[PDB]
Ligand binder design. Structure first.
Ligand SMILES: Nc1ncnc2c1ncn2[C@@H]1O[C@@H]2COP(=O)(O)O[C@H]2[C@H]1O
Ligand SMILES: Nc1ncnc2c1ncn2[C@@H]1O[C@@H]2COP(=O)(O)O[C@H]2[C@H]1O
Lengths: 501, 501, 501, 501
């Protein structure tokens, strides 16, 4: 199954490969560049590297939680389940150390991905090797075997206690897997799409909350560890609180409380620190916890300032309108009319709709505008019996407008520059010496002046909260220069409306 | 009164229905869609649902305040007023549970409101049912009746104490009414208009302050509850502080203090926590309180950064002007003149007046501009004896300008492109070889070049802080192409001013 | 001196009256509206009201600092200096209470200031009267005189102690002068110009720091007051700390420390609170201090986010340029050239110079642009021997540009659309088959194509970091259509440069 | 070597002199202005002043760390190494005091640098002299010599102890070197280029973290100093904790802990403060620490809100698109197509590319656009065999567009206004009654209508995610009016494509 076990190392066709490479042909050329690279090269955008990084993330979170508790609180932490756990974990981390010499490297100086194993080897030895080589191999068990072979009869003196304490210090080199944890979390969050579509403040504050929990855990383990490597002297907090002979659950609970009282800014344990190890560890935890909590307030502020974005923009613009009205001292009748205007026109959410449609492509503009005006097209007798290209070319030129009742849309006897379609509401056509006529949805008005370039023949007044679509002269002549056969519909309607007067 | 008691379930005509549906005809079609739906369907934007949600909000705030204090601090909390209160409340919550199977559901995937009771039933069973069914029914009294019927003679053993403690745990399922509290507060704040016109930061921080008070209250009740369900062991804070036999007022006061010392970041009660229940509850309250206080700092920051919005924009723009002047190293005479210019021209509040008027409709622009220039129209002899359509079409084209004294507005013998009306201040017309003439409010100048396309015949210098209105050539020719009969007024004035020279 | 003592009540000519009214004639009409109002009406923008508010601010800060310390810590606080101080202060506050019935009221619904004493009386009785009438009159001394006259022989029982404690509670009604303090600080900071030119975040955080100091002071006085009105019971912190018989300096110092430990989030005094007065006062101070400190963090954040405004804008735009270069993966040669371009062109501070000049008036634009190009005008032989109107009309059309060395400004044989003046640097004119010629400051190039509409006759390459001024074709033809006599200078230079080839 | 030791005092040619003066000729004129100034004038932008300020920064950080610990914790701090250290440091600070009378002063009111030694002397005596003259000279050793000479036999009384304590107070005048530290850090960070290219929030928070460490250090020294100058009374924290006779390491560690518990908001030392010196010093440290920590939260917030700038802008704009789609209730098919459109078109980072290219100069625009389209130019047969001036003038006019598959790019029989080049993807040309033809990279389409002004002859539909370059009609006619010889290539291709139909 060397074909099946070789297809996982190359970037398969998905949403991510079709996002990062362009089209499927670039994905195929990338796969051909992978297959010709060498002996089993791992592409970083592949399927094996992704789920391998995910299993290593789960294993690193398990190790960085378990390992300090196993080192500090347990006395002879060399039983068979502990050594089996450390050796299985270090087996996986040596496997990942070896596979990092076969992984393509995404470099932010080239559009391509480095797949030459010599450059991969030199760049991986250049920056992130020594910390991964320290963190992968079991340094403590190597040291125990070396100390066994140098002196076989060494475990009967006061040197042996020093060797056990130095073993418990060397076994904390596995906490250098935080580097691989941070790198694999950043790569995984860049690749995995549900965290990619999230807001960056949310992903950033989840990373911070994870790091705060991890540092509070490690700090509690450190608060117990440094008095544990001193035979619990009479001034450390353990011997003062008489927690030397409790269970490890109570020791870990009170040590985590003593660390957490300095992370979330409370303080202290039972008393003030007394011994110098206590004072300097407490000041270390106070620095780390106050920095992490200041960053937590910073991320909470940056998250809260980006929640109700368009509603906040609407309220900022309407607050500027309020301050404009107060600055020019408008009467409260007009202020009430403007309050009703902004709550009818924008409906609480203000959009830069021109820029939003300008970012989109042409068929998406055509599709959205055909969707947003389907009630108009269904209601109007003209658009329902016309060319859909003509309907779309007309609807891309319209402008949404809202008129309060009583407003004069068109004044009788001025030079007209717009043409109105009615989406919603009714209007009253007032003509001097004639009866007013109501117009409703689907009906349009103000088209004789766009055909004849004369002056307005009849005033038009609103009756309800009218929602109209305006059309300029230039766009109307442009769309009729596209389609001169639909001009005769407006000429028929305008001749009939001149016949009514 | 089935007509009167059926008109409340449908959305009546108000500001909210005329905002959310369009006009009154859409409200009537919505009411006809409600009346044809089925057996007593409740519309969510109606009048019954609104005030029913308001009474349920008052009842839930009362329940979530009272119920934990009644469970934790009182010993045999099964007297008649307590059971009457629980049964009346659970009656109201079962009524609201039943009415949620008849309420229209506003879904953010359709412009319509779902009124089909089958879809209402399936969607309500889909997400928010199990928590409301747990929180509505009295689980504890059902459990007491079931335990009574299984064993009648059960209340004489050590099982009975366990049944009483399990009753006090099951009675905390009424604290799952926080879900209905949060949902009904969000719907009520969306509907009720005085919180709708508020800034979203204010409504958001009021919701947070309510939740902080509620979590501090529940946390104090929890800090007493977990030692109360352990017969007050000798390491809990109650038996250490000898508060086992105090009144419930003092127990609740000190428990609320012990919770609140961790909410507002102070710490602790009398001593450090000792027992493991104390340590883990204290760390729980430290997480909850530090998170709520970090969010409180975040909302206070987001509120404070949006208070004096246009004044902050004015000071940002003037700070950029200050840094421009310092970057180009302007002499302090010009810096003083620019400081006086920005404090005369904008008067401390800077508005994007072009965009503010561009968002408004046409009659509101006409009405605001007729208001802001009524001193000019009353002062000028031309505008007070003219067509109000002409006055409005002229005033929409003017541009407000401010000139410091000594400034040359018009230099003698250049090609003129603007025309100035005087709102406030006096100017000196200087002509080579002739006497200067003062012009005051209502008088205009710079109009011969807009009629003749020649060059400027006389320089004009300011005398005070002049507030003028400028008019371009193109707008002047446009407005006279509208109204060619008002051209003769300017031709008469220009012929008289050429006659003066 | 009724003329001299009547000129202070009306707004004199200053920067503030010439800012808020327009010109000096509006100030004179305002003074005539003041003088005709009635019996000694005080204008709110005057000189008497300003310095009267300032003396009342100093007196209120003195009273709100001194009065709680005098009430709480001193036992029989009825010696002659204390009563003289209270009676002199209440004399001033009754004077200000009376003068508030003669002060003009600035209302944010009218451009005018209300000077009718009936509307002043009704509006002042409407909102801010009852709190000022309580805070001005001595309620405690009136109560002592009334209690003296009801029972002369009352000071020999247990009623007398209750009357003394009720006197010390009634004397805290003078702490309702905080309302007048807040109102007069807001009016004074609006009027006084050195705080008006300050950034609003600075003034706002100074107001907050003042309020935080005042609430910490009052809270320390309250922490001592409530145990002082209980004969110091055995569970209050005073009798626990044995501070009942200390001096008042030590009592005030430790009470202010006990309040301040809850304002700046530290906690506590010597121990936890024990009595219920201690617990509820400590929770009150924890609410007040945590709210004030969250607002202090909010104002510090809003202040810090607006300090290096144009430098922050430059670094935001250059960070976007960096991310553009990294997104398109530009080679590091071009990235170094763009880094040098942004550090030569903008010099670390990026200005929206088009908008900054567009906000200014015409003579200020002319004056700034004549200042910023005086080295060019002094260096060029053309501008130093020309019409200053021509120089200014040319300099308003120029555009500043920066070219790195090696760049081809003009390529030989293209259609030219710009004309370059050299402010700084030297260029090499390269012509096919001819020798290169250096051009230096004052010399201009690229003008034959603007006179002849042909194609470029010679390439031009930069030699140093050239700072040039570009001039478009349209502006060049516009300025020569203004002044056709300066065309012959460019025609002479262009004929000479064609003669050189 | 007076030439070599005189070249360091003048600004040499580097990136900084070529940034701040313009070109190398202005640097040479600045050097000639330096050399003619007087007896050894130091230019502030030179090389000697920079590294002299750097050595003084290192020496001031050393002094402000060491000096308070040497004064407070050591008893008879007058051994030979301490006096040698103070005298060597004060020698360097007197040297810097003298050299400040020879340093050019950058004033923010002139483009030039003041090098007149009279103005340098008067301005340096005007503002920053008295604090530098106090901080430079050893006041304590002068006082000891003066007290020795006034009374030789003075060191045998109770006056001598007062003289030693007054010596330890006068020796804290060396802590006024913080002024020179702050000024030299601000000048050094303005000059040194790696901190100049940093974001200002990073430099500002590094300055704040340095000041917080320094104030925590000085506050710990003060917390020990004020009980040290009182013979350790029985109520200070030293005699309560029995730390009077510990080593100075333990005294400094616990004093720094007692200061730091109030800086990072924890509190307290062993108990509450008792003596009045303890209470007022603790309240001083609480003010200073709470202010510094509120500013630290402010700088962390201002840093975090400016990290992923273009990604945050992309997510803000796409959140506005999401709220647009939810506001108009688009069907989820179109929402999925718009999600794929924004993740193909912008790829997670949204740039204002028009403004970014508009800020750049002309050759940098030409170079970036020739880089970003080299795959197109290499792929197209036209551009690879053409004038590079023509290629660049064409590529400056193109517009990048992205079409999803299935989209109709060009509809058959409309009036065409654009011309499409294919960068990536394939399209299907559909013609009525003919076979579809695939077009791939390098091929262009939609050019017959730009040559003939007719209507579209064939529809074009996308097949993959097409990345195209559009070209308008006006730019196409402009570029062919530049180069009429490349029109015949498009005429040949269009005649061949008409021949295919
Ligand atoms: N004697 C005058 N009295 C009033 N206005 C004048 C007089 N002379 C010139 N003006 C005005 O000054 C303007 C300067 O430019 P115009 O000549 O275009 O139009 C001129 C008139 O409006
Ligand atoms: N048979 C064809 N092969 C290639 N391109 C074609 C063919 N027919 C039409 N086109 C292209 O499709 C375009 C559609 O609009 P035009 O007719 O303006 O220009 C057309 C050509 O560029």
């Amino acid at each position: 199954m060397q074909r099946q076990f070789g297809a996982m190392l190359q970037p398969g066709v998905n949403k991510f490969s079709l996002r990062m490479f362009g089209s499927q042909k670039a994905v195929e050329r990338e796969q051909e560049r992978v297959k010709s690279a060498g002996f089993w090269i791992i592409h970083p955008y592949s399927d094996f590297r992704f789920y391998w990084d995910l299993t290593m993330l789960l294993l690193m979170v398990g190790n960085l939680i378990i390992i300090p508790v196993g080192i500090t609180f347990f006395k002879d932490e060399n039983t068979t389940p502990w050594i089996v756990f450390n050796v299985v974990s270090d087996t996986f981390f040596l496997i990942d150390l070896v596979l990092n010499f076969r992984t393509g490297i995404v470099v932010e100086d080239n559009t391509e991905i480095i797949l030459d194993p010599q450059r991969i080897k030199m760049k991986y030895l250049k920056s992130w090797f020594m910390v991964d080589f320290i963190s992968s191999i079991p340094v403590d068990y190597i040291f125990l075997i070396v100390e066994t072979r140098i002196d076989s009869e060494v475990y009967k003196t006061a040197r042996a206690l020093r060797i056990v304490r130095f073993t418990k210090i060397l076994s904390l080199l596995r906490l250098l897997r935080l580097s691989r944890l941070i790198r694999y979390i950043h790569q995984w969050e860049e690749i995995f799409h549900m965290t990619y579509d999230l807001a960056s403040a949310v992903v950033r504050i989840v990373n911070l909350i994870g790091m705060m929990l991890l540092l509070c855990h490690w700090d509690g383990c450190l608060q117990f560890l440094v008095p544990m490597l001193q035979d619990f002297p009479d001034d450390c907090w353990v011997s003062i609180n008489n927690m030397v002979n409790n269970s490890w659950g109570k020791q870990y609970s009170y040590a985590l409380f003593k660390a957490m009282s300095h992370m979330l800014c409370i303080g202290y344990g039972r008393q003030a620190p007394v011994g110098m190890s206590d004072v300097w560890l407490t000041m270390l935890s106070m620095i780390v916890g106050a920095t992490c909590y200041a960053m937590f307030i910073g991320h909470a502020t940056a998250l809260i300032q980006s929640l109700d974005s368009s509603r906040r923009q609407y309220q900022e613009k309407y607050k500027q309108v309020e301050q404009y009205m107060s600055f020019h001292k408008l009467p409260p009748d007009t202020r009430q009319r403007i309050h009703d205007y902004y709550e009818h026109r924008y409906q609480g959410k203000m959009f830069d709709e021109e820029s939003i449609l300008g970012e989109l492509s042409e068929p998406l503009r055509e599709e959205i505008i055909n969707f947003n005006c389907r009630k108009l097209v269904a209601s109007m007798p003209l658009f329902a019996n016309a060319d859909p290209n003509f309907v779309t070319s007309m609807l891309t030129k319209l402008r949404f407008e809202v008129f309060q009742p009583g407003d004069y849309i068109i004044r009788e006897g001025t030079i007209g520059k717009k043409m109105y379609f009615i989406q919603h509401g009714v209007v009253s056509v007032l003509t001097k010496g004639n009866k007013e006529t109501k117009l409703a949805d689907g009906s349009y008005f103000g088209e004789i002046c766009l055909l004849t370039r004369g002056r307005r023949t009849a005033s038009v007044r609103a009756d309800t909260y009218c929602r109209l679509y305006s059309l300029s002269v230039d766009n109307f002549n442009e769309v009729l220069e596209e389609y001169p056969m639909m001009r005769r519909a407006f000429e028929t309607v305008a001749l009939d409306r001149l016949d009514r007067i």
